[PDB]
Amino acid sequence: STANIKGLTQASRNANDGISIAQTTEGALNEINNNLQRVRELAVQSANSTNSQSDLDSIQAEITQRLNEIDRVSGQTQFNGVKVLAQDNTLTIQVGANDGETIDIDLKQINSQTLGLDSLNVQKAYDVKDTAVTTKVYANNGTTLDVSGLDDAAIKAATGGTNGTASVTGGAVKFDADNNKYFVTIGGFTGADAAKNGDYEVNVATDGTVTLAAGATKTTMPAGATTKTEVQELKDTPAVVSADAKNALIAGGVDATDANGAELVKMSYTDKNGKTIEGGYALKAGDKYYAADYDEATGAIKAKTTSYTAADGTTKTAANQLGGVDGKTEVVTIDGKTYNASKAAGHDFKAQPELAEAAAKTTENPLQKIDAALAQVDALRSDLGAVQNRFNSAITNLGNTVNNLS
């Protein structure tokens, strides 16, 4: 009789834990349901051709936030340490005084993947274009600097000296990039004209022709000066892609030949109506675009890459390609599968072989899919409510049995 009384009484405390498990799980499933209803409403809103890709991009961002919130609740909700929505798990609770007098609680893994929505996407592809990044650098042209005319008579005519035989020292000319100027050193004057020996600015015709202007007077050769033998002229030069940028791409799985011929570009994205907006910078290798940072002031280029632990256990990196459904999403390709860069970061494919792949296209019949998920959640909520009634009825029956024994 004592065994029974103490056993039934403890069995009743056990039943209360079943009820707690059930309420903790229901609470969380209620929150998941709220997030799913918002997702459904957002899908209805996206099914409107008046929406621009910018609009859809905004709706998608919010859908992704809701889905992530669902994965948060699913992964962290707990009762005495049990992650009730994290795995399929049949919990058995003894509700009688003897072995086997139990009620099972069938917990199920409920997350965006098991609900069939981790690839849910309402975006549309942008028309992707690019513009080569250049710089302005002074170069030449076969137009040599002709200073043969600036002879003794010409130098005398411009400076007013008469003593000695003056000449362009070394027949050399110096160039200042800062102001597209030219300079020469004059020597040879003697007597009181010796003071005219020094440096003078000269004018270069849109031809070799170098000349000294009347009234000319020696100045100070501008620092930064440098000898040029042909006419200087500014022409666009493709931004230089560094070895470490190329090597970062290769380390990141980009083909060696393609990476070696990488080109810095500025992205552009045009929508279905024809409107175009500028994107960020990227390294175009082969026919693919890999996101990159670019310091206009320095020319320093930094290839964006994602680090992670491969299935073989080692640490590797993947180049962040511009792709995904919209065409401007940072994705990575690892061992036969494509993932969103942000999701693969820090991931351990050895410890967790499974990671959701990036959406490859716009979702077809999204509402049918969101509705299926809502039905899965309602089905689990119903079952939990019924098992809650079974625990409650057990508590009632245990209470009476104990009453009569005592």
Numbering used by the authors: 54 to 459
Please give the exact wording used by the authors of the publication that reports this structure.
The long external filament of bacterial flagella is composed of several thousand copies of a single protein, flagellin. Many S. enterica serovars express one of two distinct flagellins, FliC or FljB, in a process called flagellar phase variation. We show that both flagellins of Salmonella enterica serovar Typhimurium, FliC and FljB, are methylated at surface-exposed lysine residues by FliB. Lysine methylation increases the surface hydrophobicity of flagellin, and enhances flagella-dependent adhesion of Salmonella to phosphatidylcholine vesicles and epithelial cells.
